[PDB]
Amino acid sequence: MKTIFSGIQPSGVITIGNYIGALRQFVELQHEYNCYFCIVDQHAITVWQDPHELRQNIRRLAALYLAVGIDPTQATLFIQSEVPAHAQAAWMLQCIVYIGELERMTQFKEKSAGKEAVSAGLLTYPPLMAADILLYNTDIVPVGEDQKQHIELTRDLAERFNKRYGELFTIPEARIPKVGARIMSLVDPTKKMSKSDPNPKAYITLLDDAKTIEKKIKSAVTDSEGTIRYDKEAKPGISNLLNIYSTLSGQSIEELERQYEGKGYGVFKADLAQVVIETLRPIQERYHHWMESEELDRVLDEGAEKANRVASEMVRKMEQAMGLGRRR
Amino acid sequence: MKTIFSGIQPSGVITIGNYIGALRQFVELQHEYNCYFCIVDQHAITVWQDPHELRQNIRRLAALYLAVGIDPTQATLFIQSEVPAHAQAAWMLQCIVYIGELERMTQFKEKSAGKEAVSAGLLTYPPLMAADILLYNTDIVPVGEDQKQHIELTRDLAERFNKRYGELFTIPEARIGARIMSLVDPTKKMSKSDPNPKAYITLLDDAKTIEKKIKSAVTDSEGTIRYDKEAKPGISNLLNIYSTLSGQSIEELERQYEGKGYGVFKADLAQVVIETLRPIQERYHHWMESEELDRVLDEGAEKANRVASEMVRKMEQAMGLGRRR
Numbered sequence: 134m135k136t137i138f139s140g141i142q143p144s145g146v147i148t149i150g151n152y153i154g155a156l157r158q159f160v161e162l163q164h165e166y167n168c169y170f171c172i173v174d175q176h177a178i179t180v181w182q183d184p185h186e187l188r189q190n191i192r193r194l195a196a197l198y199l200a201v202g203i204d205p206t207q208a209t210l211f212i213q214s215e216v217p218a219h220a221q222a223a224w225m226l227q228c229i230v231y232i233g234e235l236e237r238m239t240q241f242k243e244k245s246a247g248k249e250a251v252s253a254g255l256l257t258y259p260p261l262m263a264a265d266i267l268l269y270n271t272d273i274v275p276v277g278e279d280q281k282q283h284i285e286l287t288r289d290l291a292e293r294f295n296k297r298y299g300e301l302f303t304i305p306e307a308r309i310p311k312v313g314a315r316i317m318s319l320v321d322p323t324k325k326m327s328k329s330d331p332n333p334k335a336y337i338t339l340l341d342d343a344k345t346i347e348k349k350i351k352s353a354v355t356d357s358e359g360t361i362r363y364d365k366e367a368k369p370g371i372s373n374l375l376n377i378y379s380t381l382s383g384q385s386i387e388e389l390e391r392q393y394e395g396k397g398y399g400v401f402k403a404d405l406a407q408v409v410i411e412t413l414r415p416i417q418e419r420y421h422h423w424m425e426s427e428e429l430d431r432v433l434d435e436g437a438e439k440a441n442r443v444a445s446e447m448v449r450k451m452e453q454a455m456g457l458g459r460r461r
Numbered sequence: 462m463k464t465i466f467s468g469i470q471p472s473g474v475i476t477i478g479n480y481i482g483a484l485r486q487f488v489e490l491q492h493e494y495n496c497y498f499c500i501v502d503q504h505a506i507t508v509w510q511d512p513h514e515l516r517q518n519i520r521r522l523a524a525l526y527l528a529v530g531i532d533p534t535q536a537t538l539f540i541q542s543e544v545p546a547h548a549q550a551a552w553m554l555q556c557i558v559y560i561g562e563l564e565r566m567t568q569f570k571e572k573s574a575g576k577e578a579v580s581a582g583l584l585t586y587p588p589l590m591a592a593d594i595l596l597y598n599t600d601i602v603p604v605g606e607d608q609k610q611h612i613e614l615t616r617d618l619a620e621r622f623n624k625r626y627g628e629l630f631t632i633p634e635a636r637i638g639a640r641i642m643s644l645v646d647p648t649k650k651m652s653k654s655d656p657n658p659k660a661y662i663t664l665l666d667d668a669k670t671i672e673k674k675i676k677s678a679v680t681d682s683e684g685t686i687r688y689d690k691e692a693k694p695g696i697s698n699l700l701n702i703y704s705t706l707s708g709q710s711i712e713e714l715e716r717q718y719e720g721k722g723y724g725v726f727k728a729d730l731a732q733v734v735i736e737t738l739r740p741i742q743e744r745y746h747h748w749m750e751s752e753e754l755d756r757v758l759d760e761g762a763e764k765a766n767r768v769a770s771e772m773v774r775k776m777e778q779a780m781g782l783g784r785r786r
């Protein structure tokens with residue numbers, strides 16, 4: 134069995150595009166793979182964070198992952214800062230990465246934009262991410278092309294350590310098993326839907342209430358043709374809505390096209406709004422149950438204990454290879 | 462009860478200059494102050510360390526501090542890597558420090574000077590040093606003048622953190638016991654990391670080594686035993702070592718060796734060093750052969766961990782990490 138590690142940024146609340154692209158399939162994948170889901174609060178403070186908002190977003194994210202079907206007895210769900218091994222191994226990895234390798238990172242050259250003076254944490258983001266992955270002998274990281282450079286560095290650091298001290302790390306690969314449709318912004322169908330869009334009409338989050346879902350689908354961009362047909366280059370907006378509808382309803386695009394022959398966009402959108410609301414309502418109900426239950430803290434307590442068991446053993450092996458500490 | 466924190470670098474040695482300059486006094490101050498003595502193995506690996514030699518030198522330094530007289534029922538002696546809070550707090554402080562502050566550190570520029578392949582840890586270790594200090598609400602840090610820039614940054618990071626989040630850190634101060642110079646280049650301080658082993662006498666040098674290093678200590682060719690830092694830095698430094706170890710003033714040593722040569726003066730000084738180190742080395746071997754050494758280090762980590770994990774809990778609460786409520 135292969136191991137999967139997903140780091141989850143707390144600040145952002147899940148969009149349907151994330152759910153459809155890379156999260157929903159994990160409800161079943163968690164039984165075929167050994168899955169780690171890690172809320173990276175330590176990565177979150179590499180930029181400016183309001184403390185109360187960060188704490189609430191950490192909890193909300195855990196409750197959301199449980200609400201969608203992540204099973205804490207099949208997968209390991211935990212908060213990064215509650216496993217000290219991540220900080221310990223990130224320091225050891227800082228000691229084998231070259232400064233030049235960090236300065237070259239594209240994400241660091243961005244994010245450094247209209248800031249002038251930036252935190253050292255933004256430069257050492259990648260070693261901590263490599264540590265997150267490598268501590269669990271991860272085989273697969275479910276990320277897209279925007280994280281390619283970070284995965285390359287992770288693979289470089291694993292190989293450098295293995296060749297300097299002896300084989301210890303698995304060399305991870307970037308891959309989203311059973312990847313879903315790539316869902317685009319409702320406002321700009323050529324841009325991917327993302328939780329950081331400055332236009333809130335661009336995304337629907339898993340926590341949007343019905344009125345908001347209705348208004349956002351209502352304003353979603355289409356075209357002037359009035360024909361429900363998949364054509365990504367000439368009808369990117371309609372094509373995107375067909376991808377959301379198809380995956381959330383279980384009907385193929387061809388069947389939706391046949392279904393809507395002769396119909397305009399008004400009735401197709403009102404049907405899509407209902408499909409989304411019906412998808413999120415159960416998730417939102419279980420979510421509210423988790424957020425008001427003591428079982429959420431107990432679940433996260435054991436997630437961190439089970440993660441620490443694996444990661445603290447890897448730290449012991451790294452320290453032993455590098456000369457740290459004693460063996461007594 | 463003021464708190465003292467001292468880092469002990471296992472990549473280097475413990476020289477007679479450190480013993481003279483600070484370490485000898487700790488045997489006294491450990492009853493006045495709350496003293497933490499930290500073997501900073503995570504700082505050592507910013508450059509390649511031979512693993513077996515690093516592991517062994519960690520034990521050697523712990524045994525050596527005990528042999529010199531550090532009292533584990535009075536002070537805390539522990540290994541940095543055995544307290545995870547140092548790495549955790551270093552990360553949080555890395556998020557507070559600016560890259561520009563780390564890059565203009567003089568120690569970074571010197572240590573990276575001729576080096577191909579510079580690790581990020583060589584740039585980003587001042588935050589881990591700040592963490593070593595701030596975690597224990599340290600009042601006093603006993604460091605050379607070479608470290609003054611690192612103490613300034615630590616003071617800046619503590620204030621920056623205190624202003625944003627609330628008064629959590631003590632603002633520490635550098636202590637900075639004569640200043641012993643290198644035996645090979647007496648215009649430089651004797652240094653725990655000098656790459657020339659003849660530059661220093663370590664606390665573990667045996668009699669024959671001590672005699673050799675003193676014999677070849679560099680000196681002028683004029684030949685009068687007299688203190689003159691500008692013209693005669695070599696013999697002046699040897700006079701200062703001799704004075705502080707024997708209890709005699711430099712003037713009394715000058716009168717004592719009037720009309721005598723360097724050979725006889727060097728042989729007397731070598732004996733003075735040997736007689737200083739011999740009891741230290743005898744207790745060193747008993748500690749190295751003792752099960753008790755590992756028990757002292759276990760307790761030290763327990764006590765260090767209690768204070769540091771508590772401070773990390775407070776830092777996490779301030780910044781919003783975790784669930785600390």
Ligand SMILES: C[C@H]1c2c[nH]c3cccc(c23)S[C@H]1C(=O)O
Nearest residue numbers: 138139140141142173176262265
């Ligand atoms: C969440 C971030 C990161 C934290 N450590 C890990 C481990 C695996 C995947 C990722 C991450 S994905 C990456 C990102 O910026 O998207």
Ligand SMILES: C[C@H]1c2c[nH]c3cccc(c23)S[C@H]1C(=O)O
Nearest residue numbers: 466467468469470501504590593
């Ligand atoms: C040992 C080094 C360092 C590690 N963290 C600390 C904490 C206190 C004092 C020092 C240190 S002194 C410094 C040096 O290089 O001299």
